[PDB]
Design an enzyme around this catalytic site. Structure first.
Site, PDB file in Angstrom:
ATOM      1  N   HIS A 102       0.797  -1.220   0.000  1.00 52.45           N
ATOM      2  CA  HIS A 102       0.000   0.000   0.000  1.00 52.45           C
ATOM      3  C   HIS A 102       0.833   1.275   0.000  1.00 52.45           C
ATOM      4  O   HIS A 102       0.332   2.326  -0.421  1.00 52.45           O
ATOM      5  CB  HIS A 102      -0.920  -0.007   1.222  1.00 52.45           C
ATOM      6  N   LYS A 104       2.945   4.468  -0.614  1.00 52.87           N
ATOM      7  CA  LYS A 104       3.051   5.392  -1.738  1.00 52.87           C
ATOM      8  C   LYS A 104       4.190   6.362  -1.440  1.00 52.87           C
ATOM      9  O   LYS A 104       4.102   7.187  -0.515  1.00 52.87           O
ATOM     10  CB  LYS A 104       1.711   6.085  -1.975  1.00 52.87           C
ATOM     11  N   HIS A 327      -8.992  10.316  -0.581  1.00 52.82           N
ATOM     12  CA  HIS A 327      -8.161   9.128  -0.604  1.00 52.82           C
ATOM     13  C   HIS A 327      -6.937   9.288   0.287  1.00 52.82           C
ATOM     14  O   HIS A 327      -6.207   8.310   0.504  1.00 52.82           O
ATOM     15  CB  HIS A 327      -7.759   8.818  -2.061  1.00 52.82           C
TER      16      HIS A 327
END
Ligand SMILES: O=C(O)CCC(=O)Nc1ccc(C(=O)O)c(C(=O)O)c1
Length: 438
Positions: A102, A104, A327
């Site tokens: 996950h 980033k 998000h």
């Protein structure tokens, strides 16, 4: 400002709400440095789109994509990247079931130094178009002169902690980036790294990752205040995992317990969870398709209806982003009147045991399924006791922290429901005239 916390640009808001936002083209621009090589850690990639976001003069510099895909998904990503001879790939191992890569992050190596970018967006057009996303931009880290012996370490231990996070991959392509980081001076870093890696951690390693990492940092580098029991905890996320049959199973027993830690001494602390309602999604800039990036399933939700009484609407008038679905993921500790915060975290971690870890083996082992990464802003790292909350995110003493959504959060109304992505919504159309039929 000292914080270097940005939102992504949102197409459709007035210019005043994008002045000070960052698009991926701004991050990769030659103004930020002369690119030599880059690493893109992420979950989902559109490789054709991604290469077009680099400046034309930099589009053939080496790019490493760090991902978690397996089997056919892995093949599809390799096929995406094959036309570009300068792109290499690193498959992060996911040896525990139901885990995800996950994290980033961009590692950006320049002629002039090194930059680290920890953010919340997938490398696809839709994630940078009309969503609320968060970015932390590191300083330009200079290279340590060859033959000079210095740590290059910060008071937050960021350099060692970032190397530790990368070492957990056990990947040859990332050992190269570890050697790059060793050669640079990261001492100006004022944030703490909070990562998750897959594994089962006991003893000395329990505090390295997940919510125990957060707890350790709050114990060591924050101080409790009088009436600490009245300072709420706020969590804000784009997905929810299976948390158990009631709040005592995980949410309020170990997760909240870590989140409410302050200082070294030995609960009715309010817990606010912010997650888009169906109406938030329907009336958003994207409409119902925004719900494609809010993947709370009905199978999970029907097991834990107790959770939804904690849920508050998405509202972000302060940054002009109430209709830009979130998000970003954030966690923070406001004062009872929401005028100050004891700390702020921006991360990839959603509200899930897979991301934050769950205790196993009679409380002696923390099991984490996924890779996650975020940065923690602590007042002590800035010479402060608390942060004042910035009143307008994009307005004008720079020691106030830019919280990107409205406080206090607003509870769901009696007719509101959490966005659940795999059931239909056919009562009222969205901003594009459409219903939602999964
Ligand atoms: O796994 C669960 O608990 C339920 C399914 C789920 O949450 N999937 C998912 C995958 C990738 C991302 C991402 O964007 O990397 C996100 C996100 O962050 O919204 C969510």
């Amino acid at each position: 400002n000292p914080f270097q916390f940005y939102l992504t640009r949102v197409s459709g808001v007035k210019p005043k709400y994008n002045s000070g936002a960052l698009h991926i083209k701004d991050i990769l621009s030659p103004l930020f440095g002369t690119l030599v090589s880059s690493a893109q850690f992420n979950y989902c990639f559109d490789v054709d789109w991604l290469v077009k976001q680099y400046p034309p003069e930099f589009r053939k510099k080496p790019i490493l994509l760090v991902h978690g895909d397996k089997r056919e998904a892995k093949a599809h990503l390799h096929a995406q990247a094959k036309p570009y001879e300068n792109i290499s790939l690193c498959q992060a191992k996911l040896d525990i079931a139901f885990g995800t890569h996950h994290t980033k992050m961009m590692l950006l190596l320049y002629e002039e130094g090194l930059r680290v970018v920890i953010h919340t967006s997938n490398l696809i057009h839709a994630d940078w178009h009309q969503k609320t996303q968060g970015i932390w931009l590191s300083p330009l880290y200079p290279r340590i002169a060859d033959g000079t012996h210095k740590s290059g370490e910060s008071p937050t231990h960021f350099k060692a902690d970032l190397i530790s996070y990368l070492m957990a991959y056990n990947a040859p392509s990332l050992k190269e980036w570890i050697d790059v980081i060793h050669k640079h001076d990261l001492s100006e870093t004022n944030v703490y790294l909070i990562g998750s890696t897959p594994g089962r951690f006991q003893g000395s390693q329990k505090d390295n990752w997940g919510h125990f990492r957060l707890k350790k940092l709050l114990k060591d580098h924050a101080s409790s205040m009088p009436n600490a029991e009245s300072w709420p905890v706020v969590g804000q996320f784009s997905s929810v995992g299976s948390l158990g049959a009631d709040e005592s199973k995980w949410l309020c027993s170990e997760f909240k317990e870590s989140m409410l830690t302050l200082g070294k001494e030995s609960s009715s602390v309010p817990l606010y969870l912010i997650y888009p309602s169906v109406e938030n999604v329907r009336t958003s800039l994207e409409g119902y398709p925004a719900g494609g990036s809010l993947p709370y399933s009905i199978q999970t939700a029907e097991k834990q209806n107790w959770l939804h009484s904690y849920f508050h609407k998405w509202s972000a008038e302060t940054s002009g982003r109430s209709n830009a679905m979130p998000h970003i993921k954030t966690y923070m500790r406001p004062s009872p009147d929401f005028s100050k915060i004891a700390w702020f975290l921006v991360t990839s971690a959603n509200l899930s045991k897979a991301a934050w870890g769950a205790l196993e083996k009679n409380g002696t082992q923390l099991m984490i399924r996924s890779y996650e990464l975020g940065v923690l802003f602590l007042p002590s790292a800035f010479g402060l006791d608390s942060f004042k909350v910035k009143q307008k995110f994009f307005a004008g003493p720079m020691a106030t922290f830019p919280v990107p959504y409205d406080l206090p959060p607003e509870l769901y109304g009696s007719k509101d429901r959490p966005w659940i992505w795999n059931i239909p919504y056919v009562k009222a159309p969205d901003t594009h005239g459409n219903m939602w039929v999964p």
